[PDB]
């Protein structure tokens, strides 16, 4: 199985920075969603579960053929609520219709983290739409009541090594749980939409009361009304992953260089980059385009 990137015929990267301004003036307009969070959140999290269901091991899944078009990656239970993130992008494609799905899932991601004030992630144009035929089945995504080793385990299954994988964590600073989505709750009831590295502060700072939820789950709470995931907590109960978390406390810096590079290779992940490809478009936000 190899999967070549294709750019789409004729476009540059003035055509992508369109899709990118579009969604991120989009994301600016609609800012009630979720109690006001925006979708930045949920963009974030359509990209990384659009992609993290390739395998390593023969090349399946993955981001590429953008099937989570399709009903049976769409109606994934770990897919709950990303619904929202589609019907957001919709009425996008519908304007730059010769986008590839994978292309543009990806690219709001793209857009949300760095729209949110991450750091920039550059992107590479090219996923190829893929017929249901190719759709993988469910369940390869994380479950959340699990420990540091499943943790640690899951993410070989993707290539990602100790740090990439704290670091990629660090999305969990953004949005929220939804108890009719996955089965848990919080955080209690206002939520951030800028990226920090608040995550590994409220790790290492707060102080931690294991919980049993409404939906029969545990679930870490914090008195300030912070919550975290077993799996999210697992990073503080790992003597490897805790050093990195620290690390990633104290320097923002170190946590965004780290987090762009982990988030980029996740989003390629099983792709093959011809030789000719052009290189990764750096994307210019709104702000710096004074629109
Ligand atoms: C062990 C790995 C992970 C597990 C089990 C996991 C599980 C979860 C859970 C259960 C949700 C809440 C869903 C809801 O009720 O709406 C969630 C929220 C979300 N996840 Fe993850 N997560 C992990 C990895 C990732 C990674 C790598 C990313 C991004 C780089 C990420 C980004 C987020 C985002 C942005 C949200 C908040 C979405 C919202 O506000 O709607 N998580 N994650």
Same mark, same amino acid.
């Given at each position: 199985l190899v999967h070549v990137a294709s750019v789409?015929? %004729? +476009?540059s990267y003035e055509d992508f920075q369109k899709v990118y301004n579009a969604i991120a003036l989009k994301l600016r307009e609609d800012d009630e969603y979720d109690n006001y969070i925006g979708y930045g959140p949920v963009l974030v999290r359509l990209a990384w579960h659009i992609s993290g *269901?390739? =395998?390593?091991? =023969?090349? *399946? %899944? %993955?981001? /590429? %053929?953008? *099937? /989570? +078009?399709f009903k049976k990656e769409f109606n994934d239970p770990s897919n709950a609520g990303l619904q929202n993130g589609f019907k957001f992008l919709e009425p996008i494609h519908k304007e730059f219709?010769?986008?590839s799905s994978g292309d543009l899932f990806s690219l709001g991601g793209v857009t949300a983290v760095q729209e949110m004030q991450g750091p920039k992630i550059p992107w590479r144009c090219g996923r190829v739409d893929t017929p249901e035929d190719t759709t993988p089945d469910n369940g390869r995504l994380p479950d959340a009541d699990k420990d540091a080793g499943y943790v640690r385990t899951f993410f070989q299954r993707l290539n990602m090594n100790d740090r990439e994988v704290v670091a990629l964590m660090?999305?969990?600073?953004?949005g929220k749980t939804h108890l009719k989505n996955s089965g848990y709750e919080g955080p209690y009831g206002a939520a951030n939409n800028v990226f920090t590295n608040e995550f590994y502060l409220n790790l290492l700072n707060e102080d931690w009361k294991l919980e049993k939820n409404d939906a029969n789950n545990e679930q870490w709470d914090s008195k300030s009304g912070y919550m975290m995931l077993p799996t999210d907590y697992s990073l503080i109960q790992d003597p490897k992953y805790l050093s990195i978390v620290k690390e990633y406390a104290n320097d923002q810096d170190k946590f965004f260089k780290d987090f762009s590079k982990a988030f980029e290779k996740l989003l390629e992940d099983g792709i093959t980059f011809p030789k000719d490809a052009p290189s990764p478009f750096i994307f210019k936000t709104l702000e710096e385009q004074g629109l």
């Open positions: 789409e015929k %004729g +476009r *269901t390739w =395998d390593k091991h =023969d090349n *399946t %899944g %993955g981001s /590429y %053929g953008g *099937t /989570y +078009r219709p010769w986008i660090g999305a969990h600073a953004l």
